[PDB]
Amino acid sequence: FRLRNIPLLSRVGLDRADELRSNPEELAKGWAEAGLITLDVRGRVNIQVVIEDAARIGDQPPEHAVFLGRIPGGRHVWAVRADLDDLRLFDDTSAALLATAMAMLAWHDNAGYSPVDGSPTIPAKGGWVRVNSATGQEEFPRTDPAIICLVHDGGDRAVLGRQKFWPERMFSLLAGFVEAGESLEACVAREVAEEVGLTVTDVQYLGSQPWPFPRSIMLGFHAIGDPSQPFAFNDGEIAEADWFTRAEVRSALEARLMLPGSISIAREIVESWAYA
Amino acid sequence: TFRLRNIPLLSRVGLDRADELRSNPEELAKGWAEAGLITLDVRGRVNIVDGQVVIEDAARIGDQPPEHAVFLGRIPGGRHVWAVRADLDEDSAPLLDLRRSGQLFDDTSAALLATAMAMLAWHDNAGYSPVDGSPTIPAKGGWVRVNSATGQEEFPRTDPAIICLVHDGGDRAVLGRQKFWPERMFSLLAGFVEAGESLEACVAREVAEEVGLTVTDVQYLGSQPWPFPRSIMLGFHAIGDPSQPFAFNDGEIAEADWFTRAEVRSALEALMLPGSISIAREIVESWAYA
Ligand SMILES: [Ca+2]
Ligand SMILES: [Ca+2]
Ligand SMILES: [Ca+2]
Ligand SMILES: [Ca+2]
Ligand SMILES: [Ca+2]
């Protein structure tokens, strides 16, 4: 099966205007007529995202602002953190602006110092790097790849799992972070084995979604497992799991077994499987 | 469309990482006396014999796992295997690096080395918290570092990068040559995934930035660890329009062109395409002979 829909935060590619990032003159020129999106510390916004006049906060782009690119018509848009008076629905462009702003400002919050030598870092190039104050070495935004997998039997049954300390009825796909030295396919097999003890084959990619909570990209997969093999939960974070039929899943979707919100690529994978 | 013919090098085998032992300091300390040890120099080179990484006796360097060692998992016999950085005697044996000689390694050795290389390089670059600047201390067999001030765990970093073969749906594909590259050296278009974008959006954005094409039907082919120093390469193909002209926007590409399957096959059997462990070569090969 393929995904029926593009995942929600994946929909558009905004015009990021990469070439402007290293052009402080063009950034400073665009500022007077530029738009500004403002996020609080949890990455929440005012709502379509409110775009205010950048010029209101100053006559030049502040250090801690991030240049998001251009909206249709060529207006520059920036993002800043501020005290205000959760993506966790928006138009496509707002969703992309927010995903970018959220990820980038969360990175800044967590990248104030060099991991290499501990020196403070200074934002630069429209907020797309931070520079080691001592050495001049550039640090770059971090996005951790994570897999999320629907294990199925090749027919009408699929594994869903509930993490320890998730609410009782809340089941979903199996997830994990990619480790150093492994392929995505190897990561999927490893993580499924760790979580529910199954050996899976035919690991197949479905799609992807930015997941700035705070810094993931979710990579969706399906894989073939064997229901005659028993579960085993000890090595993982799963409290329980079971094989469910397409009928059960469709039923749970139409609502009791609870599946994650359409925001997650997880829901899109399950939906696309259940109605294939 | 098309699929990869081969699993990329470095993707072939998945190590027994024995994750549960990382958080069991007692079992790690017990296993040490009979444990194996792989040693990498600063450039990530090792000694190999018959395609297989040399495993020395861990006990020779000390009675306990040193702080800077990384626990790689289990080798045959129940034995633990670890990696450390060390100065290697460049004159008393050939030192092979994965990037130049990866083809010579057994699958398991290649994966051990890829993991060790990535993990030791991470340690070298993760001595301090990016959050607050505090020193960090390795723990869990080298699989985290702990903020000395706050106790917050820092985790190994792997940056996703895409690499894309843009084609016309038929018999022609874009290859591009970077400014810093020798004449006739062409390859696929590559870039790092940025915050806030999907892989598909990243592919479209990077192709646009590098050669000015608008591409659709972004399709995943495969993946390969790429510890030089800390990537994972994610291979894709996409449909471009040859009637749209190139534009070398971001300044990274000096030239690019559409090449036929015949040209590419020809260049592979020797536009220069050298031999390579990169997924890039596997993508081009798989396309050219589809
Ligand atoms: Ca551009
Ligand atoms: Ca585990
Ligand atoms: Ca051998
Ligand atoms: Ca020496
Ligand atoms: Ca690039």
TrEMBL record, chain B:
Q: Which residues bind Ca(2+) 14?
A: E285
Q: Which residues bind AMP?
A: F155, R157, D159, F192
Entry's transmembrane regions: none
Q: Where Ca(2+) 6 is bound, by residue? A: D89, D91
Keyword Manganese in record: yes
Q: Which residues bind Ca(2+) 1?
A: D19, E20
Q: Which Pfam families match?
A: NUDIX, NUDIX-like, Zn_ribbon_NUD
Q: Which family does it belong to?
A: Belongs to the Nudix hydrolase family. NudC subfamily.
Question: Which named protein is this?
Answer: NAD(+) diphosphatase
